[PDB]
């Protein structure tokens, strides 16, 4: 089997991407944030505290003939941005782009933090990291991908995120028309539960490539590219007037600037992030200070190849017995 679903930016900045997902019988379609940095499939629901729902579409398990309470199971998750959610668990049929999993754990939110409530476009998350990170207790649950894997033509999914445009998540096949040149594969460590890999270095603009190992995670659920302070300083030093602002929470630059590209290494291959991808616009409406899309990972504890980086590539998440990651230009 295979699946193929279009993923769409939630706003003009590509802050996140939503993908329609069919849950239950008859289908209830919710728009979920596919997150390769976490491992819970959770949804706004008929159980979510009413004051914490503001425009989201909710899953109502009582209206699904295939929903079953997973008795005694609870979940609670905190994300890197400080947001959080928790609740109880149903099993139900879940389909993505024509690919169906029966008995999927669908984590129903009883509580969500402010950032979730305030984002009316995101009806929940669909985790695509390794199932070892799943938060369901006392019986940990599998991700949608883990459940689908045995039925898939090939044990893979791909992320093809657009810049200011829709893109695609495919399950079970590699669309050879969706990228240019060849795919370069690189080793993954699952030790921390993430799609963790080591970039071979970077370049700023037309500068020389610096060969250096950068361990980080491929995380579709993080907007920006978070890298070591040395790397980030080298990038922003090439933008006149750019500076790190403690008050704003990172590097800012004059909105009048033209940003250089940023290249990262994948083995001997090179992925180029155009300068425009690194512009996250005014820090507040009407400001002439713009927020940067490359930020320091210092104090996160991990480097994160988020959407800024991933959207510059066609990315293969190979979930074979020995997992790997592939990157191609597109």
mmCIF file of C-alpha atoms in Angstrom:
data_model
loop_
_atom_site.group_PDB
_atom_site.id
_atom_site.type_symbol
_atom_site.label_atom_id
_atom_site.label_comp_id
_atom_site.label_asym_id
_atom_site.label_seq_id
_atom_site.Cartn_x
_atom_site.Cartn_y
_atom_site.Cartn_z
ATOM 1 C CA UNK A 1 0.000 0.000 0.000
ATOM 2 C CA UNK A 2 0.893 3.656 -0.323
ATOM 3 C CA UNK A 3 -0.517 7.041 0.673
ATOM 4 C CA UNK A 4 -0.050 10.548 -0.698
ATOM 5 C CA UNK A 5 -1.367 13.730 0.923
ATOM 6 C CA UNK A 6 -0.858 17.400 0.222
ATOM 7 C CA UNK A 7 0.515 19.514 3.056
ATOM 8 C CA UNK A 8 -0.268 23.250 3.148
ATOM 9 C CA UNK A 9 1.398 26.142 5.028
ATOM 10 C CA UNK A 10 -0.823 27.542 7.792
ATOM 11 C CA UNK A 11 0.152 31.138 7.088
ATOM 12 C CA UNK A 12 2.214 33.426 4.882
ATOM 13 C CA UNK A 13 5.419 32.666 6.809
ATOM 14 C CA UNK A 14 5.304 28.861 6.526
ATOM 15 C CA UNK A 15 5.166 28.710 10.323
ATOM 16 C CA UNK A 16 3.856 25.145 10.077
ATOM 17 C CA UNK A 17 2.151 22.844 7.603
ATOM 18 C CA UNK A 18 -1.204 21.051 7.890
ATOM 19 C CA UNK A 19 -2.220 17.815 6.234
ATOM 20 C CA UNK A 20 -5.786 16.473 6.148
ATOM 21 C CA UNK A 21 -6.288 13.205 8.042
ATOM 22 C CA UNK A 22 -9.443 11.038 8.115
ATOM 23 C CA UNK A 23 -10.300 9.661 11.562
ATOM 24 C CA UNK A 24 -13.169 7.350 12.428
ATOM 25 C CA UNK A 25 -16.265 6.009 10.703
ATOM 26 C CA UNK A 26 -17.820 7.914 9.020
ATOM 27 C CA UNK A 27 -14.629 9.891 8.422
ATOM 28 C CA UNK A 28 -13.953 13.002 10.468
ATOM 29 C CA UNK A 29 -11.335 15.057 8.634
ATOM 30 C CA UNK A 30 -8.929 17.013 10.829
ATOM 31 C CA UNK A 31 -5.957 19.067 9.682
ATOM 32 C CA UNK A 32 -2.913 17.798 11.539
ATOM 33 C CA UNK A 33 0.656 19.047 11.899
ATOM 34 C CA UNK A 34 2.888 16.157 10.806
ATOM 35 C CA UNK A 35 5.820 16.229 13.209
ATOM 36 C CA UNK A 36 8.935 14.126 12.635
ATOM 37 C CA UNK A 37 10.188 15.389 16.005
ATOM 38 C CA UNK A 38 7.521 13.709 18.149
ATOM 39 C CA UNK A 39 5.599 10.463 18.340
ATOM 40 C CA UNK A 40 2.051 11.175 19.501
ATOM 41 C CA UNK A 41 -1.016 11.492 17.270
ATOM 42 C CA UNK A 42 -3.253 13.803 19.305
ATOM 43 C CA UNK A 43 -6.319 15.793 18.400
ATOM 44 C CA UNK A 44 -8.639 18.491 19.596
ATOM 45 C CA UNK A 45 -11.779 16.626 20.576
ATOM 46 C CA UNK A 46 -15.206 16.690 22.155
ATOM 47 C CA UNK A 47 -13.290 16.141 25.428
ATOM 48 C CA UNK A 48 -11.113 19.251 25.128
ATOM 49 C CA UNK A 49 -11.789 21.887 27.786
ATOM 50 C CA UNK A 50 -14.234 24.217 26.028
ATOM 51 C CA UNK A 51 -12.392 27.446 26.866
ATOM 52 C CA UNK A 52 -9.255 25.994 25.223
ATOM 53 C CA UNK A 53 -10.959 25.432 21.857
ATOM 54 C CA UNK A 54 -11.055 28.410 19.488
ATOM 55 C CA UNK A 55 -11.935 27.492 15.920
ATOM 56 C CA UNK A 56 -10.334 24.047 15.623
ATOM 57 C CA UNK A 57 -12.183 21.105 14.155
ATOM 58 C CA UNK A 58 -12.694 18.470 16.840
ATOM 59 C CA UNK A 59 -12.740 14.676 16.798
ATOM 60 C CA UNK A 60 -15.874 13.284 18.458
ATOM 61 C CA UNK A 61 -15.267 9.620 19.274
ATOM 62 C CA UNK A 62 -18.922 9.015 20.192
ATOM 63 C CA UNK A 63 -19.843 9.709 16.553
ATOM 64 C CA UNK A 64 -17.387 7.099 15.233
ATOM 65 C CA UNK A 65 -18.605 3.513 14.999
ATOM 66 C CA UNK A 66 -14.997 2.254 15.021
ATOM 67 C CA UNK A 67 -13.769 4.261 18.047
ATOM 68 C CA UNK A 68 -12.941 2.366 21.229
ATOM 69 C CA UNK A 69 -11.697 3.803 24.502
ATOM 70 C CA UNK A 70 -8.216 2.496 25.299
ATOM 71 C CA UNK A 71 -9.135 1.909 28.902
ATOM 72 C CA UNK A 72 -6.802 3.413 31.494
ATOM 73 C CA UNK A 73 -4.453 5.012 28.983
ATOM 74 C CA UNK A 74 -3.430 8.643 29.405
ATOM 75 C CA UNK A 75 -0.896 10.864 27.672
ATOM 76 C CA UNK A 76 0.903 14.119 28.359
ATOM 77 C CA UNK A 77 3.447 15.840 26.169
ATOM 78 C CA UNK A 78 5.619 18.924 26.333
ATOM 79 C CA UNK A 79 7.285 20.313 23.225
ATOM 80 C CA UNK A 80 10.540 22.217 22.726
ATOM 81 C CA UNK A 81 8.698 25.521 22.368
ATOM 82 C CA UNK A 82 7.141 25.123 25.814
ATOM 83 C CA UNK A 83 3.702 24.131 24.551
ATOM 84 C CA UNK A 84 1.887 21.085 25.910
ATOM 85 C CA UNK A 85 -1.244 18.955 25.799
ATOM 86 C CA UNK A 86 -2.672 15.914 27.594
ATOM 87 C CA UNK A 87 -5.677 13.636 27.765
ATOM 88 C CA UNK A 88 -6.916 10.095 27.245
ATOM 89 C CA UNK A 89 -6.819 7.659 24.321
ATOM 90 C CA UNK A 90 -9.076 5.979 21.781
ATOM 91 C CA UNK A 91 -8.234 3.528 19.074
ATOM 92 C CA UNK A 92 -9.803 4.208 15.702
ATOM 93 C CA UNK A 93 -9.267 3.936 11.960
ATOM 94 C CA UNK A 94 -6.969 6.629 10.592
ATOM 95 C CA UNK A 95 -6.295 7.323 6.931
ATOM 96 C CA UNK A 96 -3.715 9.620 5.337
ATOM 97 C CA UNK A 97 -3.803 10.212 1.620
ATOM 98 C CA UNK A 98 -5.569 6.918 0.970
ATOM 99 C CA UNK A 99 -3.413 4.830 3.356
ATOM 100 C CA UNK A 100 -5.470 3.315 6.165
ATOM 101 C CA UNK A 101 -4.387 2.069 9.590
ATOM 102 C CA UNK A 102 -6.902 0.293 11.807
ATOM 103 C CA UNK A 103 -6.453 0.336 15.573
ATOM 104 C CA UNK A 104 -4.393 3.550 15.585
ATOM 105 C CA UNK A 105 -4.017 5.247 18.961
ATOM 106 C CA UNK A 106 -5.790 8.600 18.679
ATOM 107 C CA UNK A 107 -4.898 10.686 21.706
ATOM 108 C CA UNK A 108 -7.824 12.885 22.681
ATOM 109 C CA UNK A 109 -6.875 16.180 24.296
ATOM 110 C CA UNK A 110 -8.539 17.147 27.528
ATOM 111 C CA UNK A 111 -6.163 20.106 27.914
ATOM 112 C CA UNK A 112 -4.000 22.090 25.521
ATOM 113 C CA UNK A 113 -1.706 25.036 26.200
ATOM 114 C CA UNK A 114 -2.322 28.578 24.975
ATOM 115 C CA UNK A 115 -0.277 28.320 21.771
ATOM 116 C CA UNK A 116 -2.457 25.458 20.553
ATOM 117 C CA UNK A 117 -5.706 27.235 21.417
ATOM 118 C CA UNK A 118 -4.516 30.380 19.645
ATOM 119 C CA UNK A 119 -3.744 28.509 16.430
ATOM 120 C CA UNK A 120 -7.138 27.817 14.908
ATOM 121 C CA UNK A 121 -5.603 26.166 11.839
ATOM 122 C CA UNK A 122 -4.024 23.173 13.625
ATOM 123 C CA UNK A 123 -6.437 20.479 14.815
ATOM 124 C CA UNK A 124 -3.700 18.312 16.350
ATOM 125 C CA UNK A 125 -0.359 16.660 15.674
ATOM 126 C CA UNK A 126 0.638 13.447 13.922
ATOM 127 C CA UNK A 127 3.991 12.277 15.246
ATOM 128 C CA UNK A 128 6.469 10.622 12.890
ATOM 129 C CA UNK A 129 9.525 10.224 15.135
ATOM 130 C CA UNK A 130 10.293 6.816 16.656
ATOM 131 C CA UNK A 131 7.615 5.161 18.778
ATOM 132 C CA UNK A 132 9.992 5.018 21.769
ATOM 133 C CA UNK A 133 9.071 8.700 22.331
ATOM 134 C CA UNK A 134 5.328 8.073 22.470
ATOM 135 C CA UNK A 135 3.924 9.371 25.778
ATOM 136 C CA UNK A 136 0.951 7.047 26.304
ATOM 137 C CA UNK A 137 0.988 5.393 29.737
ATOM 138 C CA UNK A 138 0.957 2.671 30.964
ATOM 139 C CA UNK A 139 1.103 1.043 27.519
ATOM 140 C CA UNK A 140 3.191 2.977 25.010
ATOM 141 C CA UNK A 141 1.612 3.260 21.557
ATOM 142 C CA UNK A 142 2.932 3.140 17.995
ATOM 143 C CA UNK A 143 2.989 5.978 15.511
ATOM 144 C CA UNK A 144 0.879 5.966 12.371
ATOM 145 C CA UNK A 145 4.019 5.179 10.342
ATOM 146 C CA UNK A 146 5.049 2.303 12.616
ATOM 147 C CA UNK A 147 1.562 0.804 12.335
ATOM 148 C CA UNK A 148 1.447 1.274 8.552
ATOM 149 C CA UNK A 149 4.971 0.031 7.891
ATOM 150 C CA UNK A 150 4.355 -3.658 7.297
ATOM 151 C CA UNK A 151 1.628 -2.881 4.741
ATOM 152 C CA UNK A 152 3.663 -0.285 2.846
ATOM 153 C CA UNK A 153 5.286 -1.145 -0.480
ATOM 154 C CA UNK A 154 8.542 0.212 0.988
ATOM 155 C CA UNK A 155 9.084 1.167 4.664
ATOM 156 C CA UNK A 156 9.542 4.873 3.984
ATOM 157 C CA UNK A 157 7.813 8.203 4.024
ATOM 158 C CA UNK A 158 8.932 11.379 2.301
ATOM 159 C CA UNK A 159 8.562 15.062 3.137
ATOM 160 C CA UNK A 160 8.426 17.546 0.270
ATOM 161 C CA UNK A 161 7.590 20.850 1.937
ATOM 162 C CA UNK A 162 6.904 23.932 -0.138
ATOM 163 C CA UNK A 163 8.240 27.447 0.184
ATOM 164 C CA UNK A 164 5.124 29.611 0.434
ATOM 165 C CA UNK A 165 3.299 26.813 -1.373
ATOM 166 C CA UNK A 166 1.743 23.393 -0.779
ATOM 167 C CA UNK A 167 3.875 20.261 -0.768
ATOM 168 C CA UNK A 168 3.455 16.539 -0.228
ATOM 169 C CA UNK A 169 3.865 13.740 2.321
ATOM 170 C CA UNK A 170 4.116 10.321 0.659
ATOM 171 C CA UNK A 171 4.026 6.968 2.444
ATOM 172 C CA UNK A 172 5.426 3.754 1.027
ATOM 173 C CA UNK A 173 7.128 5.022 -2.127
ATOM 174 C CA UNK A 174 9.687 7.480 -3.428
ATOM 175 C CA UNK A 175 8.323 9.753 -6.182
ATOM 176 C CA UNK A 176 11.259 9.939 -8.577
ATOM 177 C CA UNK A 177 9.626 12.903 -10.352
ATOM 178 C CA UNK A 178 9.651 15.050 -7.207
ATOM 179 C CA UNK A 179 13.387 15.788 -7.003
ATOM 180 C CA UNK A 180 16.355 16.581 -9.201
ATOM 181 C CA UNK A 181 19.640 14.714 -9.379
ATOM 182 C CA UNK A 182 20.222 11.885 -6.922
ATOM 183 C CA UNK A 183 19.210 11.248 -3.313
ATOM 184 C CA UNK A 184 22.105 11.154 -0.845
ATOM 185 C CA UNK A 185 21.496 8.900 2.127
ATOM 186 C CA UNK A 186 23.065 9.368 5.542
ATOM 187 C CA UNK A 187 23.072 7.362 8.770
ATOM 188 C CA UNK A 188 20.469 7.871 11.507
ATOM 189 C CA UNK A 189 20.807 7.350 15.241
ATOM 190 C CA UNK A 190 17.566 6.423 16.999
ATOM 191 C CA UNK A 191 19.207 6.629 20.431
ATOM 192 C CA UNK A 192 17.191 9.713 21.422
ATOM 193 C CA UNK A 193 14.072 8.679 19.470
ATOM 194 C CA UNK A 194 14.573 11.236 16.717
ATOM 195 C CA UNK A 195 15.614 11.191 13.071
ATOM 196 C CA UNK A 196 19.081 12.214 14.219
ATOM 197 C CA UNK A 197 21.902 12.518 11.695
ATOM 198 C CA UNK A 198 25.216 14.317 11.161
ATOM 199 C CA UNK A 199 25.611 17.034 8.557
ATOM 200 C CA UNK A 200 29.082 17.281 7.021
ATOM 201 C CA UNK A 201 29.318 21.082 7.167
ATOM 202 C CA UNK A 202 28.071 24.387 5.847
ATOM 203 C CA UNK A 203 28.673 27.431 3.684
ATOM 204 C CA UNK A 204 27.348 30.976 3.907
ATOM 205 C CA UNK A 205 26.344 32.527 0.608
ATOM 206 C CA UNK A 206 29.056 32.053 -2.016
ATOM 207 C CA UNK A 207 31.636 31.399 0.709
ATOM 208 C CA UNK A 208 33.864 28.365 1.016
ATOM 209 C CA UNK A 209 32.410 25.191 2.500
ATOM 210 C CA UNK A 210 33.444 24.472 6.074
ATOM 211 C CA UNK A 211 33.813 20.754 6.713
ATOM 212 C CA UNK A 212 32.551 20.097 10.227
ATOM 213 C CA UNK A 213 30.248 17.522 11.811
ATOM 214 C CA UNK A 214 26.885 18.903 12.952
ATOM 215 C CA UNK A 215 24.668 16.396 14.736
ATOM 216 C CA UNK A 216 20.994 17.336 14.577
ATOM 217 C CA UNK A 217 17.448 16.168 13.991
ATOM 218 C CA UNK A 218 15.224 16.338 10.934
ATOM 219 C CA UNK A 219 12.121 17.934 12.462
ATOM 220 C CA UNK A 220 9.156 18.916 10.294
ATOM 221 C CA UNK A 221 7.401 20.232 13.418
ATOM 222 C CA UNK A 222 9.961 22.983 14.057
ATOM 223 C CA UNK A 223 9.744 26.111 11.917
ATOM 224 C CA UNK A 224 13.348 27.324 11.920
ATOM 225 C CA UNK A 225 16.899 26.031 11.503
ATOM 226 C CA UNK A 226 18.702 25.870 14.875
ATOM 227 C CA UNK A 227 22.473 25.402 14.684
ATOM 228 C CA UNK A 228 25.549 25.929 16.880
ATOM 229 C CA UNK A 229 26.266 29.502 17.885
ATOM 230 C CA UNK A 230 29.524 29.529 15.911
ATOM 231 C CA UNK A 231 27.707 28.621 12.679
ATOM 232 C CA UNK A 232 24.848 31.058 13.265
ATOM 233 C CA UNK A 233 27.231 33.917 14.060
ATOM 234 C CA UNK A 234 29.141 33.241 10.850
ATOM 235 C CA UNK A 235 25.891 33.436 8.882
ATOM 236 C CA UNK A 236 24.546 36.657 10.389
ATOM 237 C CA UNK A 237 27.938 38.368 10.212
ATOM 238 C CA UNK A 238 27.314 38.515 6.448
ATOM 239 C CA UNK A 239 24.147 40.596 6.874
ATOM 240 C CA UNK A 240 24.748 44.299 7.547
ATOM 241 C CA UNK A 241 22.978 45.374 10.708
ATOM 242 C CA UNK A 242 22.039 41.877 11.872
ATOM 243 C CA UNK A 243 22.306 41.229 15.603
ATOM 244 C CA UNK A 244 21.117 38.918 18.316
ATOM 245 C CA UNK A 245 18.400 40.547 20.383
ATOM 246 C CA UNK A 246 17.707 39.183 23.861
ATOM 247 C CA UNK A 247 14.475 41.209 23.952
ATOM 248 C CA UNK A 248 13.156 39.684 20.724
ATOM 249 C CA UNK A 249 14.508 36.186 21.363
ATOM 250 C CA UNK A 250 17.076 35.735 18.625
ATOM 251 C CA UNK A 251 18.775 37.150 15.560
ATOM 252 C CA UNK A 252 17.049 40.028 13.807
ATOM 253 C CA UNK A 253 18.108 41.908 10.722
ATOM 254 C CA UNK A 254 17.093 45.027 8.805
ATOM 255 C CA UNK A 255 14.084 44.294 6.641
ATOM 256 C CA UNK A 256 15.893 46.177 3.855
ATOM 257 C CA UNK A 257 18.586 43.461 3.680
ATOM 258 C CA UNK A 258 19.108 40.852 0.994
ATOM 259 C CA UNK A 259 19.910 37.613 2.816
ATOM 260 C CA UNK A 260 22.618 35.221 1.658
ATOM 261 C CA UNK A 261 21.869 31.563 1.049
ATOM 262 C CA UNK A 262 22.947 28.884 3.529
ATOM 263 C CA UNK A 263 24.316 25.519 2.384
ATOM 264 C CA UNK A 264 24.401 22.371 4.509
ATOM 265 C CA UNK A 265 26.239 19.148 3.735
ATOM 266 C CA UNK A 266 24.728 15.701 3.443
ATOM 267 C CA UNK A 267 27.688 13.426 2.910
ATOM 268 C CA UNK A 268 29.434 14.811 -0.187
ATOM 269 C CA UNK A 269 26.164 16.440 -1.328
ATOM 270 C CA UNK A 270 25.056 19.995 -0.664
ATOM 271 C CA UNK A 271 21.577 21.406 -0.012
ATOM 272 C CA UNK A 272 21.212 25.143 -0.637
ATOM 273 C CA UNK A 273 18.665 27.129 1.357
ATOM 274 C CA UNK A 274 17.912 30.334 -0.596
ATOM 275 C CA UNK A 275 18.241 33.562 1.343
ATOM 276 C CA UNK A 276 14.533 34.290 0.975
ATOM 277 C CA UNK A 277 13.715 31.137 2.982
ATOM 278 C CA UNK A 278 15.553 32.665 5.957
ATOM 279 C CA UNK A 279 13.337 35.789 6.095
ATOM 280 C CA UNK A 280 10.569 35.495 8.688
ATOM 281 C CA UNK A 281 9.416 39.063 8.278
ATOM 282 C CA UNK A 282 8.804 41.929 10.651
ATOM 283 C CA UNK A 283 9.107 41.118 14.352
ATOM 284 C CA UNK A 284 5.813 42.958 14.865
ATOM 285 C CA UNK A 285 3.393 44.443 12.357
ATOM 286 C CA UNK A 286 4.971 47.415 10.595
ATOM 287 C CA UNK A 287 8.421 46.969 12.120
ATOM 288 C CA UNK A 288 11.533 47.407 9.994
ATOM 289 C CA UNK A 289 13.321 44.760 12.090
ATOM 290 C CA UNK A 290 12.892 41.301 10.588
ATOM 291 C CA UNK A 291 13.239 37.929 12.312
ATOM 292 C CA UNK A 292 15.864 35.465 11.130
ATOM 293 C CA UNK A 293 15.185 31.910 10.087
ATOM 294 C CA UNK A 294 18.556 30.584 11.294
ATOM 295 C CA UNK A 295 18.910 30.761 15.074
ATOM 296 C CA UNK A 296 21.254 29.414 17.718
ATOM 297 C CA UNK A 297 20.585 26.014 19.256
ATOM 298 C CA UNK A 298 22.604 26.947 22.351
ATOM 299 C CA UNK A 299 20.418 26.092 25.336
ATOM 300 C CA UNK A 300 18.092 23.838 23.309
ATOM 301 C CA UNK A 301 20.545 21.003 23.755
ATOM 302 C CA UNK A 302 20.175 19.763 20.176
ATOM 303 C CA UNK A 303 20.567 21.138 16.671
ATOM 304 C CA UNK A 304 17.338 21.137 14.669
ATOM 305 C CA UNK A 305 16.961 20.951 10.915
ATOM 306 C CA UNK A 306 13.455 22.378 10.897
ATOM 307 C CA UNK A 307 11.238 23.491 8.054
ATOM 308 C CA UNK A 308 13.627 26.233 6.840
ATOM 309 C CA UNK A 309 16.132 23.523 5.992
ATOM 310 C CA UNK A 310 13.818 20.670 5.056
ATOM 311 C CA UNK A 311 11.723 22.679 2.591
ATOM 312 C CA UNK A 312 14.861 23.221 0.491
ATOM 313 C CA UNK A 313 15.024 19.450 -0.112
ATOM 314 C CA UNK A 314 13.119 16.316 -0.953
ATOM 315 C CA UNK A 315 13.618 14.282 2.239
ATOM 316 C CA UNK A 316 13.341 10.505 2.597
ATOM 317 C CA UNK A 317 12.657 9.073 6.042
ATOM 318 C CA UNK A 318 13.745 5.476 5.562
ATOM 319 C CA UNK A 319 12.289 3.310 8.315
ATOM 320 C CA UNK A 320 13.954 0.067 7.289
ATOM 321 C CA UNK A 321 15.520 -2.085 10.009
ATOM 322 C CA UNK A 322 18.554 0.186 9.796
ATOM 323 C CA UNK A 323 16.987 3.629 9.381
ATOM 324 C CA UNK A 324 18.532 6.305 7.209
ATOM 325 C CA UNK A 325 17.699 9.770 5.890
ATOM 326 C CA UNK A 326 17.929 10.823 2.266
ATOM 327 C CA UNK A 327 18.180 14.327 0.858
ATOM 328 C CA UNK A 328 17.849 15.506 -2.737
ATOM 329 C CA UNK A 329 17.651 18.915 -4.312
ATOM 330 C CA UNK A 330 14.376 19.786 -6.039
#
